[PDB]
Design a protein around this ligand. Structure first.
Ligand SMILES: C[C@@H]1O[C@@H](O[C@H]2[C@H](O[C@H]3[C@H](O)[C@@H](O)[C@@H](O)O[C@@H]3CO)O[C@H](CO)[C@H](O)[C@@H]2O)[C@@H](O)[C@H](O)[C@@H]1O
Lengths: 308, 315
């Protein structure tokens, strides 16, 4: 029976599965009131991708498609409607059992990046800064179309292959609706999201979720926003490759310093693909960025973790 | 000996190790005249990273540092000097045996992306939070001001004033600014990491076929353009996921060449075979240039270690 394993990449060798960023710190927040139900970076321990999760680091919060219409904003900026395909360029089939095209953003906010185009008919090219408001009524990726806005007023071509490269957030002020745990309405506001990866939570008292946290760039304004993922992208890729059978619902993992061999703390790695620790405080976990998680053994829901 | 393995990823599940792009096609060009000596995506089969190669997909062609001041330059735009650190924020030690900070671009051109800043100082009235800004930027890697091995580079912006001196700065690559003649795009020309007229050091070695009839096989991605005409591409020797896998496994290399087969798993039939060389590159028996037309659900499978006398089946 294929033994379960995690990669031997250190924190400084891991990337976020919910936005294209390095992992900066491990992090807890026991008093979080939101339901944690992100859709990228979702993979079971036996290698089943869930939600909108796909394997490419370049596909996280990316879109591919074509522009079909230009509409000027009531105040400032220009909006462009974009039909979206699968990231591999094949048409998106709304009947497939996914919430949205794989790679679609899984949080409410104004996502800042670059739209680029390379024409079909050597080809002409253009690129501009762009913002995608995932809370907008026009954010309907499950129906095959989204809207982006630009500061550029005219030089975006219709009917030509278009790529969105995410870079960060446009703003986190009150009017920008940034909330990392609020899912977009993938089909628009009056329609239920479907085919979601399940919510995650600790089930044992005194435990809290452990996140891999990355700080996300901002186009302007004040803030130090972060995106927390349940497992880094390299873990998604590893679990998918190995497809090792899960022998219980909960694996015990140890965070180790290899310099010393000492265990710094232990955690539960749950079958659905998330970590819990026994910690009663919020904030970063102070540890070397050369530490890493090692699988110890399968345990069960009733195992008592050593406190952090 | 731990058996050598490759990951089981189709072309559509792989990314480029020289720029943050998906792999689009496999590609050959037997008549290439340049020396192929790229410095990102360099890893031996037993897991030794070489050149400027590092493991993060977000680190490829990225920079981290601080803007110092606005500077004058003959070229169009507004220009800024920035010191560069290691990507993990620690100071870059020029005495380390590397060509430049890991992740530094390994080709001549005008690299287009976004510079972003998050200030160190916070404002009590803003909830004790820092101010931020981001703007499009271009780094000309052929410029005499591109001196990452000395710990500083220059970038240009269309924005004329809203870049802050002394503040932490990140460069996120997106594509190229141009591939016109005056933009000096050449994927096989290395930057001068310490400036004009200095010799680059600590380089990963050049790669080439040894056997007649063989040519290099590349993983090709098409790179976006800010403007102008073109369909530029970046060719890597192995995808970033192979770098990551080889690094993890560190399997001993039992000869100088591994025989690999590109397989369609649906039929289990081999589409073609290739040599995977110890230093981390592929060759095939092909006498044409251009894409390899095969399913993007195909993948390479390790078959066996072979010796210097193996003749590959023509593709
Ligand atoms: C804090 C400063 O941010 C930028 O100022 C620009 C300003 O940014 C505003 C955002 O557009 C808005 O969404 C929200 O986040 O508030 C920001 C200001 O607090 O926008 C105007 C245009 O309306 C200008 O572009 C300002 O420069 C940044 O550019 C500054 O350098 C500051 O960091």
């Amino acid at each position: 029976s294929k033994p379960f394993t995690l990669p031997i990449l250190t924190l400084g060798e891991l990337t976020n599965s919910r936005f294209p960023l390095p992992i900066d710190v491990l992090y807890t927040n026991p008093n979080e009131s939101a339901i944690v139900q992100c859709q990228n970076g979702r993979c079971t321990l036996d290698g089943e991708l869930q939600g909108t999760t796909q394997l490419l680091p370049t596909g996280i919060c990316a879109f591919r498609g074509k522009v079909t219409q230009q509409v000027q904003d009531e105040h400032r900026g220009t909006h462009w409607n974009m039909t979206v395909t699968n990231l591999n360029g094949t048409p998106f089939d709304p009947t497939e059992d996914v919430p949205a095209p794989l790679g679609t953003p899984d949080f409410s906010g104004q996502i800042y990046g670059v739209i680029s185009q390379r024409n079909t008919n050597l080809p002409a090219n253009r690129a501009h800064e762009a913002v995608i408001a995932t809370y907008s009524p026009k954010f309907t990726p499950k129906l095959g179309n989204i809207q982006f806005s630009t500061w550029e007023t005219q030089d975006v071509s219709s009917g030509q292959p278009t790529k969105f490269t995410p870079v960060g957030l446009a703003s986190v002020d009150a009017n920008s609706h940034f909330d990392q745990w609020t899912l977009p309405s993938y089909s628009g506001a009056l329609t239920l999201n479907m085919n979601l990866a399940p919510s995650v939570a600790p089930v044992f008292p005194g435990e809290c979720l452990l996140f891999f946290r990355s700080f996300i760039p901002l186009k302007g304004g004040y803030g130090n926003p972060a995106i927390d993922c349940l497992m880094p992208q390299e873990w998604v890729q590893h679990l998918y490759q190995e497809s090792a059978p899960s022998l219980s619902d909960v694996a015990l993992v140890r965070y180790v310093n290899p310099e010393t061999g000492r265990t710094l703390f232990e955690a539960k790695l749950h079958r659905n693909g998330f970590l819990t620790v026994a910690r009663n405080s919020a904030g970063p976990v102070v540890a070397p960025t050369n530490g890493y998680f090692r699988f110890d053994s399968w345990v069960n829901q009733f195992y008592t973790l050593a406190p952090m």
